[PDB]
Amino acid sequence: VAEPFAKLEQDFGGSIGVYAMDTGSGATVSYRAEERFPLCSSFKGFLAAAVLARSQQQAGLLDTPIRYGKNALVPWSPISEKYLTTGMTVAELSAAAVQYSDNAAANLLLKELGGPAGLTAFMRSIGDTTFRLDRWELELNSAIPGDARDTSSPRAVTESLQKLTLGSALAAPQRQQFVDWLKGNTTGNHRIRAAVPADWAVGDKTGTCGVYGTANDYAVVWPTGRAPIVLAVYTRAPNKDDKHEAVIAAAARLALEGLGVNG
Ligand SMILES: O=C(Nc1nnn[nH]1)[C@H](Nc1ccccc1)c1ccccc1
Ligand SMILES: O=C(Nc1nnn[nH]1)[C@H](Nc1ccccc1)c1ccccc1
Numbered sequence: 359v360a361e362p363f364a365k366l367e368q369d370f371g372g373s374i375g376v377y378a379m380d381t382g383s384g385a386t387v388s389y390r391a392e393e394r395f396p397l398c399s400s401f402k403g404f405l406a407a408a409v410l411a412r413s414q415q416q417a418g419l420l421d422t423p424i425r426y427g428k429n430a431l432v433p434w435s436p437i438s439e440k441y442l443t444t445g446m447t448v449a450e451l452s453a454a455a456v457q458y459s460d461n462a463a464a465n466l467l468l469k470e471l472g473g474p475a476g477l478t479a480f481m482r483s484i485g486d487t488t489f490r491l492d493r494w495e496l497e498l499n500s501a502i503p504g505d506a507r508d509t510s511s512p513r514a515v516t517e518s519l520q521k522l523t524l525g526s527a528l529a530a531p532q533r534q535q536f537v538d539w540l541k542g543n544t545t546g547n548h549r550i551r552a553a554v555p556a557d558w559a560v561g562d563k564t565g566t567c568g569v570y571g572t573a574n575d576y577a578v579v580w581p582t583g584r585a586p587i588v589l590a591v592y593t594r595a596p597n598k599d600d601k602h603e604a605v606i607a608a609a610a611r612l613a614l615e616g617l618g619v620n621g
């Protein structure tokens with residue numbers, strides 16, 4: 359049903375993209391689900407999944423320490439700036455990237471994977487032909503209208519998230535670690551999580567470009583007594599000065615309602 363989403367995005371003053379999947383029944387909710395939206399920091403969830411995939415062929419990868427200096431620091435590195443010189447393990451960097459959106463951590467891990475093209479290669483390997491990362495933090499946040507760099511679609515985000523958290527794309531230990539990192543995210547309390555009852559489990563990764571009304575969140579949600587739901591909510595707006603969380607929460611509420619999920 360497009361009517362409620364159309365009213366929401368008109369009130370917002372931009373475009374809202376939603377794809378939600380009930381993994382039990384297969385029912386879906388789609389609104390602008392195949393349009394490209396900027397990933398912004400939301401790429402960092404898939405980055406951590408790619409690191410975990412690498413751990414399936416490199417023993418002890420997650421506990422390997424990476425040393426870095428002031429030169430590795432990027433604005434908004436709230437974890438990595440505290441562990442300078444002495445460095446952090448690959449697992450610590452991955453958790454910081456997912457749960458605090460740490461920019462230096464993300465760029466360090468990106469470097470280990472061969473840059474944006476290496477993360478894109480990992481997404482291709484799990485069957486995602488839509489995702490593309492082209493740049494690093496912070497340039498990937500430009501969110502220019504019509505620019506395909508550093509974008510995906512809500513549908514492709516949800517499908518890949520499902521494969522990685524609930525399907526067979528990662529081995530079982532790596533899958534659970536990915537879920538656990540998403541569950542511990544600290545940046546999403548006002549987005550999808552605000553639409554989810556307190557007694558349901560949720561893991562998410564947010565993104566905020568800071569321009570063009572562009573922000574997003576994707577999540578796996580475990581209601582009690584039924585199969586998990588996977589969903590993605592992305593926004594953008596036509597003007598650079600347009601502001602982007604309540605709209606994301608409202609869109610998530612509508613998506614769950616459209617799936618018949620009482621919550
Ligand atoms: O967990 C692994 N592998 C696996 N488990 N399930 N599927 N692959 C091992 N990696 C790993 C990564 C970080 C920390 C500890 C272990 C591993 C990789 C390669 C050879 C042998 C072991
Ligand atoms: O540098 C290190 N440890 C150290 N520095 N000063 N005192 N201990 C390295 N371990 C490490 C472990 C976790 C986080 C950061 C660094 C290391 C130890 C041994 C061989 C190679 C690397």
Ligand SMILES: O=C(Nc1nnn[nH]1)[C@H](Nc1ccccc1)c1ccccc1
Binds near residue numbers: 434458459496565
């Ligand atoms: O919001 C951010 N990161 C993030 N949000 N969700 N996940 N990560 C960062 N600050 C921010 C806060 C409010 C509005 C705009 C930006 C940030 C994003 C992009 C460039 C520079 C800084």
